[PDB]
Symmetry: C2
Subunit: 360 residues, 2 copies
């Protein structure tokens, strides 16, 4: 089948397995099963499935150059699809919880899950917990007999933990580190001294890159029994590089993409987030521009938000972005060349991942 | 050492390991490390450590009757302490998140974690996520070389999933099942037809008993390499029985124990929870009493809450509780007798667990 058709068919199988198990072993009743089916569909479906399909595409690459029985090819592709859905459900977990944490209104043009009338925060926090628990159920069920079960569970845990740490870095990025204290309400920074490239890079590395690029690439290697055939330090370096670029694109879109196309209203400015735009602006502003940014950033007032967007346009951050992009292109191509030494097939899969990222 | 002294010493070791790893591998800075240290202390310490100490006590029982080198005894006890802290951190996760979900005010006489001024819900949801992630970090680190790693991780996952399902059952227990729908705000039941013993038993089994009694008992067996030496169906039956009694005690205390001793104000009546008191009251009420309960249950109005408490006293639910307790005593003693067939040592550990529960 087309890879996407196989991936979506496996969703139906995994959902049926999870819901049937709830009936047979957890005494669930049909109405709560229906609630959870709708929750799964609403939180897990409707995106592009980039992360899950990366697992599939990596596995397909190795299948084309490795001798296998037909039944083994089918097993590997089925495993890649389940593993990809583990990542999609993990993402669903972090979007449900982050939308609650951030007080978000919309996502993908629909209300955030916790805002559905019959859900509410009381249920939605636990729904997000269940989403992540489902990732572990699918691994222990589908991969019970597999040689890579241990490495895959270990990786998944490390990536999940990194991502939770990243969320902490993200939501505290507008506070002075020396003022962080559970006992004291957290004031917004006034000097913005921690709005630097290195600190931004730290936030993004943990909050996004591990689960968006490192986990799908390595899971593809694991279900293919091909990890020995790559230099893991290069996989990490290229995942963190492409992942950062992905997030910079998202940062720019939050500010400048119309809500209709964006699927939501961006509020990074009002939320005083350490965005690529803010960091890059502060890296080239003169004193008067820095002062005007400070006087307006992180406030809900729409005229103050408009001031900040005006500063960004006046500062020609398009030029900085094109320079950033050119450098990422140089570095990603270099890492892909290095990947070819041990694994030309994996290098081409990484090239495909970059192309999809770059021309999005 | 006294078992408790060893258990608390291992907390310091585990905390140091987790925080040092955040420095060495996650680029954490000292102020965020301090925040997380306070979060850990505030959410994990201050209880009686009943669940974690059960692991230790089960392991101690087997040590007394099994030939081991001294270094192996120390290893087993250290493993039991780490495993016990995994359960204590798991509980900490579900208390942080449940307090947010339920809008709780106090716990153990202190503000709920999310209500600390420098925390807020935005941070506290993610802090609870981190608490559970820490359970997995400690398992993969401390038990990396152990034969029971796989079984322990598998058990932990199944117990965590059961508990999340239980929370869903708990927070939806005042809604008619046929009206559950994400699209429609959930009305409180008017007939209370789902306030039955069997439905109550289902809620409690999943929401509490798996992590409070089954997980500590089986983890004690696993770190002792002694699970083959017991009939697992009896361990499950006795865990679910003692766990239910534990929750019934908690239900009664929420209504009748003074806030000073309780550590909080109970709001089960206002929250329309399917409590043992409500179910038992409806199991003996006459028509006029049922009508008065319906007219007053699940409302914040303090005079309506007082009406409900008056109905409970007038109905002499003390008598039903003493009858319930007598039956649990009969059944637990019977299961302990059965446990002696294969494992007299484990049976005595279960007897200790019951005694601590019963005379609380
Ligand atoms: C409108 N607009 C953009 O659309 C944009 C941008 N930087 C990148 N993009 C895409 N800047 C600074 C901008 O003003
Ligand atoms: C005051 N009170 C109690 O203290 C109590 C109880 N049932 C059990 N207990 C302990 N009932 C019904 C009660 O009215």
């Amino acid at each position: 089948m087309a890879s996407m058709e196989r991936f979506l068919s496996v969703y139906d199988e995994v959902q049926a397995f999870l819901l049937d198990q709830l009936q047979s072993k957890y005494e669930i009743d049909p109405n709560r099963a229906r609630y959870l089916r709708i929750m799964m569909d609403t939180t897990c479906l409707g995106g592009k499935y980039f992360r899950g399909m990366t697992v599939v595409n990596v596995a397909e690459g190795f299948l084309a150059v490795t001798q296998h029985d037909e039944a083994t090819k089918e097993r590997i592709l089925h495993d890649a699809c389940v593993g990809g859905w583990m990542i999609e459900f993990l993402q669903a977990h972090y979007l449900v919880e982050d939308d609650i944490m951030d007080g978000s209104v919309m996502r993908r043009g629909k209300p955030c899950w916790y805002r559905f009338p019959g859900v509410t925060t009381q249920c939605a926090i636990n729904d997000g917990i269940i989403l992540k628990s489902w990732t572990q159920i699918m691994a222990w069920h589908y991969f019970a007999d597999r040689p890579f079960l241990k490495d895959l569970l270990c990786l998944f845990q490390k990536v999940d933990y990194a991502t939770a740490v990243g969320q902490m870095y993200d939501v505290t990025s507008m506070c002075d580190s020396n003022k962080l204290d559970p006992e004291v309400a957290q004031p917004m920074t006034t000097d913005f001294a921690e709005f630097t490239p290195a600190i931004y890079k730290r936030i993004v590395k943990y909050k996004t890159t591990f689960y968006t690029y490192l986990l799908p690439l390595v899971m593809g290697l694991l279900v293919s029994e091909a990890a020995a055939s790559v230099e893991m330090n290069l996989v990490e370096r290229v995942a963190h590089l492409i992942g950062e670029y992905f997030q910079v694109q998202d940062d720019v879109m939050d500010c400048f993409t119309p809500p209709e196309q964006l699927g939501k209203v961006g509020t990074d400015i009002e939320d005083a987030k350490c965005s690529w735009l803010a960091v890059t602006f502060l890296g080239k502003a003169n004193a008067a521009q820095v002062a005007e940014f400070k006087a307006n950033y992180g406030e809900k007032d729409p005229a103050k938000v408009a001031v900040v967007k005006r500063l960004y346009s006046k500062a020609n951050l398009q030029a900085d972005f094109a320079a950033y992009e050119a450098e990422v292109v140089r570095e990603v191509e270099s890492l892909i060349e290095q990947l070819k030494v041990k694994s030309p097939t994996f290098a081409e899969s990484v090239a495909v991942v970059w192309e999809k990222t770059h021309k999005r």
